[PDB]
Design a protein around this ligand. Structure first.
Ligand code: 7G6
Length: 265
């Protein structure tokens, strides 16, 4: 079921490079748009991924980028997914031409929050939630991408909490100090993502290094309010950053809060 015949693919344009190498845009059976990850040799724990691919193909939600299948009878193996015409959320936010209204920004947060509440319902962690790992389709809908894939990355610079690629700025204190990953580390990262959205893609803690950020966070300092966020929006993002993990909300609660502010604003 998971298995796609690579002969059914027509490759058309390069989309860029990520943690597992090049990704292309193409067509499946002459007709259907798809993105195709061509997994770089040595970048991925391929046999582990392939077993997990079966669980991932049952994750289906309108705000999650859909996995369509894998091509495994070969090397490089390919991962085939839904295509998102406007690319990564971070770069979309940084394009000032969009002149976003705050109602649009809140809708992006709600899109992600729906996807994350679905994952939480399935006890599945993203592990690398950030605007760089959300994608935007041709209707301006945001969807969460590459959830779970951090587990198969072979690169020590990405996996170590002191690596140059580790997502320090998206991590709660208990992840930085003890590697304690949970639903509540996704919640923390979601707060940082809302902050990214409302800051139009500024880097979190933009004047600090990763090392200084970790120390700031441990002393209890936080990101402060983006100019575009109302007080009510800021309360929601700030709630994700409680020092104590069990005092942070769930994605179900966060969704309820976002819907309430949409109605008020
Ligand atoms: C001027 N611009 C040039 C670029 N244009 C433009 C650009 C991309 C698109 N669409 C898509 C891009 C992509 C994509 C393309 C390249 C790299 C990546 N990436 C990015 C990050 C990451 C992170 C991980 C972490 C979890 C371990 C794993 C990973 F595997 C990755 C990965 O693979 C991704 C996202 O999966 C995926 N889909 C599914 C698209 O649909 N559409 C228009 C926009 C206009």
């Amino acid at each position: 079921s998971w298995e796609i015949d690579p002969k059914d693919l027509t490759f058309l344009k390069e989309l860029g490079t990520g943690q597992f190498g090049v990704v292309k845009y193409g067509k499946w059976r002459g007709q259907y748009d798809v993105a195709i990850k061509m997994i770089k040799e040595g970048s991925m724990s391929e046999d582990e991924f392939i077993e997990e691919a079966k669980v991932m193909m049952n994750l289906s939600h309108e705000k999650l980028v859909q996995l369509y299948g894998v091509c495994t009878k070969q090397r490089p193996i390919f991962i085939i997914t839904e295509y998102m015409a406007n690319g990564c959320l971070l770069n979309y936010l940084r394009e000032m031409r969009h002149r976003f209204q705050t109602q649009q920004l809140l809708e992006m947060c709600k899109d992600v929050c729906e996807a994350m509440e679905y994952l939480e319902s399935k006890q599945f962690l993203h592990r690398d939630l950030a605007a760089r790992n959300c994608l935007v389709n041709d209707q301006g809908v945001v969807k969460v991408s590459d959830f779970g894939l951090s587990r198969y990355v072979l690169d020590d610079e990405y996996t170590s909490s002191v690596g140059s690629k580790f997502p320090v700025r998206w991590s709660p204190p208990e992840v930085l100090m003890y590697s304690k990953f949970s639903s509540k580390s996704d919640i923390w990262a979601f707060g940082v993502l809302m902050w990214e959205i409302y800051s139009l893609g500024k880097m979190p803690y933009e004047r600090f290094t990763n090392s200084e950020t970790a120390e700031h966070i441990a002393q209890g300092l936080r990101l402060y309010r983006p100019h575009l966020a109302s007080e009510k929006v800021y309360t929601i993002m700030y709630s994700c950053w409680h020092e104590k993990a069990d005092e942070r909300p769930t994605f179900k609660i966060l969704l309820s809060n976002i819907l309430d502010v949409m109605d008020e604003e």
